[PDB]
Amino acid sequence: KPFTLPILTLGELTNSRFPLPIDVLYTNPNESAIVQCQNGRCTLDGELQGTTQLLPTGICAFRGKVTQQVQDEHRGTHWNMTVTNLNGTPFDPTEDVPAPLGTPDFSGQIYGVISQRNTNTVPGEGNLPANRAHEAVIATYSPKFTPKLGNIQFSTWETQDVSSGQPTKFTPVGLASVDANSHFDQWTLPSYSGALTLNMNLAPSVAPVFPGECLLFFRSFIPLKGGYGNPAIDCLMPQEWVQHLYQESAPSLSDVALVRYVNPETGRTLFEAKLHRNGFLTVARNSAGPVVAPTNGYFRFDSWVNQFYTLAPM
Amino acid sequence: SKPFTLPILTLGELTNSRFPLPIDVLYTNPNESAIVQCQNGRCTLDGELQGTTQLLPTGICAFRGKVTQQVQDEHRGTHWNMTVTNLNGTPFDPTEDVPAPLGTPDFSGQIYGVISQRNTNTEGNLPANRAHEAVIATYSPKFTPKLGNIQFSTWETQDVSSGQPTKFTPVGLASVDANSHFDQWTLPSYSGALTLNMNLAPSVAPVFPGECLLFFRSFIPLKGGYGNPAIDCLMPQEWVQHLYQESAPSLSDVALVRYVNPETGRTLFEAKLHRNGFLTVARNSAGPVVAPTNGYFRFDSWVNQFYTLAPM
Ligand SMILES: C[C@@H]1O[C@H](O)[C@@H](O)[C@H](O)[C@@H]1O
Ligand SMILES: C[C@@H]1O[C@H](O)[C@@H](O)[C@H](O)[C@@H]1O
Ligand SMILES: C[C@@H]1O[C@H](O)[C@@H](O)[C@H](O)[C@@H]1O
Ligand SMILES: C[C@@H]1O[C@H](O)[C@@H](O)[C@H](O)[C@@H]1O
């Protein structure tokens, strides 16, 4: 079965690591961190890895139940919530994944909304349940961030109106802050089972091997609740590619696919890239920053090549 | 002729095309009195997007633009006038043959979400940001997205900036009380109340007796109050994306599809997938379809509109 990519253009793609549109292609050759994100991880023959799942709505989402308000040294009102799988089934800590699928894969203060729809109903309200929603922040670097253990902590500005024991949804919106104390680092993994514990079942790190090549990312700018900053989240492949590869399950015929970024209006190749078996791109570029190209561009699969192939410089 | 196909995503791998929600259940309501004419999640089987439908899951019920004016509510809250652009940032051209900017909500209600802003200009060199909860009343006379401007309301009374890039991220509904006018089949008046909506995707309905529409239903969060609101789409967003990609010619008015249990390989029921992009089943009851969420629709064959469905 022939390998293919979707023909979605850049303006028709979304980020696999946060629910955002793709804004720009981006490189950063001098990156010192190990790149080992756990969302948006899928091999070219369709094997999901890390905490990757298929739903755009599941990325950095949680589902579970608040248990109680809990004490924390930091500003705001804090709440513990048990988390299930996103489909509502209990999370089994013995499954070979790093954390429930969809769990955030970076250090930071994730801003969003916690909502609740009670289980118990009121006969006088037409047998309908009570609801509430409030802004919330999940500090994924917190020692109380233990999604692999089945529970996480979030904070609210709201001091009282979060109910114990009720079905709870976290909808991610952006970051609370990127100030010095907010520990935003997109390449630092949370400790999924808590402070001082080793993460397990991780999708592998990715890196260029060939001289003069660097990783190519699909970058999205992420909203901020407050403060100064222009934070971005870089993914290895957009969510649509994860969905496409998963569907197709086409055998990989070598370790490296040649892809060309094409202008569909002019028919011209703007540059070429290696699409590696483990699900990431490299290009021959010697600079950091955006790739300035029209957002109607798209990657076209050309052929299977190998580690010895020399890319034309971008 | 390029063969027609559906994705092999199961129900638990699908999302709603009318609000950013996972699909929870398949659903019927044969006795629905409303005309069904939603404008998001509209795609013909040969890949033609219709209504306000666009491809991004992040674009559904999203807005992008700039705030122009602050107006205090007479009682509580603050209203903000927002010019809106296309989601890709380009100016919205009201002369384009669409009902409203793609992604515009397609139902009456108070849509609850978060307005966020990242300023354009900067003596530090990083832009200032803010976000607050917001509500967009799509039934409001000030909801005129086809004219390039809408209004949202906030609890926040001051901290929303004019002339700065603004994003609305939808989250759910503010209320489904009587005074909140939630009706998922009532279209907003995209240009205001006394004006006719234009360029609409057509209404959908069974043509053959004994059939009813089959929906992909999602439950939508509420900011407050009592309720268990739901939003029904004709096809999930992944089907819109797939059909658009494939652009396979339609070889009859109807693609017969079977909902299959892959564990047993058995067909649970069959449905008609109509050319204009919607499902009907032979069912004479309302409510969820009780089936495993690892079930999925498989394309069987092109059939005629006169084909008689096996009763569910
Ligand atoms: C719920 C809280 O309301 C306050 O007025 C705001 O200043 C905070 O940002 C937060 O939204
Ligand atoms: C930099 C400042 O951050 C704060 O949280 C906001 O409330 C202000 O509007 C401003 O953007
Ligand atoms: C910003 C507003 O803060 C208040 O405390 C809350 O009661 C409202 O629901 C809203 O979130
Ligand atoms: C019915 C009530 O709606 C309000 O908005 C909420 O703040 C309460 O917790 C409760 O659910």
How close does chain A come to B171, measured CA to CA in Å?
Answer: 7
Q: Can you give the CATH number for the domain in which B150 is found? A: 2.40.30.120
How close does chain B come to A160, measured CA to CA in Å?
Answer: 14
Structure-solving method: X-ray
Q: Do B55 and A115 touch (CB under 8 A)?
A: no
Ligand 4 lining (C-beta closer than 6 Å): A 130-132, 161; B 224-226
Distance between CA B171 and CA B114 in Å, rounded? Answer: 7
Q: In this structure, are residues B259 and B10 in contact, taking their beta carbons and an 8 Å threshold? A: no
Last residue of a domain, one of A133, A157, A176: A176
The total number of residues shown for chain A amounts to 314
Burial of residue A267 (CB within 10 Å: 0-12, 13-18, 19+) is: exposed
Burial of residue A210 (CB within 10 Å: 0-12, 13-18, 19+) is: middle
Last residue of a domain, one of A176, A192, A217: A176
User: Are residues B71 and B170 both part of a single domain?
Assistant: yes
Q: The tokens of B216 are what?
A: 């992909």
Chain B residues touching residue A113 (CB < 8 angstroms): 114, 133, 171-172, 221
CA A31 to chain centre: 19
User: Are residues A156 and A203 both part of a single domain?
Assistant: no
- Total domains, chain B: 2
The per-residue b/e assignment along A134-144, b for 16 or more CB within 10 angstroms, e otherwise, is bbbbbbbbbeb
User: Are residues B20 and B64 both part of a single domain?
Assistant: no
Please state, in angstroms and as integers, the Cα–Cα distance from residue A195 to each residue in A129, A137, A145, A189, following that order: 38, 19, 9, 12
Closest among B302, B312, B295 to B274, alpha carbons compared: B302
User: Are residues A29 and A70 both part of a single domain?
Assistant: no
Q: Report which residue type is found at B232.
A: D
Closest among A248, A221, A244, A247 to A234, alpha carbons compared: A221
Distance between CA B220 and CA B233 in Å, rounded? Answer: 12
Distance between CA B226 and CA B240 in Å, rounded? Answer: 33
Domain that holds residue B147: 60-174
Alpha carbon dihedral A283, A285, A287, A292, in 10-degree steps, equals -70
User: Are residues B52 and B64 both part of a single domain?
Assistant: no
Closest among B110, B89, B109, B104 to B51, alpha carbons compared: B104
| Contacts with A285 (C-beta within 8 Å, 6 or more apart), sequence order | A27, A29, A213, A214, A216, A313, A314
User: Are residues B189 and B298 both part of a single domain?
Assistant: yes
Chain B residues touching residue A55 (CB < 8 angstroms): 13-15, 22
Distance between CA A281 and CA A290 in Å, rounded? Answer: 15
User: Are residues B33 and B139 both part of a single domain?
Assistant: no
Q: The tokens of A144 are what?
A: 């109380």
Q: In this structure, are residues B280 and B214 in contact, taking their beta carbons and an 8 Å threshold? A: yes
User: Are residues A154 and A186 both part of a single domain?
Assistant: no
3-state percent helix, strand, coil for chain B, nearest multiple of 5: 5, 35, 55
User: Are residues B295 and B246 both part of a single domain?
Assistant: yes
What 3-state DSSP class applies to A170?
A: strand
User: Are residues B228 and B185 both part of a single domain?
Assistant: yes
Q: In this structure, are residues A91 and A78 in contact, taking their beta carbons and an 8 Å threshold? A: no
Last residue of a domain, one of B151, B174, B197: B174
Distance between CA B116 and CA B34 in Å, rounded? Answer: 35
Q: In this structure, are residues A56 and A251 in contact, taking their beta carbons and an 8 Å threshold? A: no
Q: Can you give the CATH number for the domain in which A304 is found? A: 2.40.510.10
Chain A residues touching residue B225 (CB < 8 angstroms): 130-131
Distance between CA B301 and CA A187 in Å, rounded? Answer: 48
Q: What letter would DSSP give residue A90?
A: P
Distance between CA A49 and CA A41 in Å, rounded? Answer: 5
Distance between CA A65 and CA A168 in Å, rounded? Answer: 5
Where do the DSSP E strands lie in chain B?
25-28, 63-72, 78-84, 110-118, 128-137, 149-154, 165-173, 212-219, 224-226, 230-233, 254-261, 266-274, 278-281, 287-288, 296-303
Atom 9, ligand 3: residue with shortest CA distance: A134
Query: Is the dihedral angle over the CA atoms B90, B93, B99, B100 positive or is it negative?
Result: positive
User: Are residues B298 and B228 both part of a single domain?
Assistant: yes
Where do the DSSP E strands lie in B97-234?
110-118, 128-137, 149-154, 165-173, 212-219, 224-226, 230-233
Distance B154 CA to ligand 1 centre (A): 11
Distance between CA B86 and CA B100 in Å, rounded? Answer: 9
Number of H helices, E strands in chain B: 1, 15
Query: Is the dihedral angle over the CA atoms A101, A102, A103, A105 positive or is it negative?
Result: positive
The total number of residues shown for chain B amounts to 312
Distance between CA B279 and CA A18 in Å, rounded? Answer: 32
Using alpha carbons only, what angle is made at residue B150 by residues B145 and B152, rounded to the nearest 5 degrees? 145
Closest ligand to residue A132's CA: 4
A14, A174, A228 member nearest B116 (Cβ): A174
User: Are residues B210 and B287 both part of a single domain?
Assistant: yes
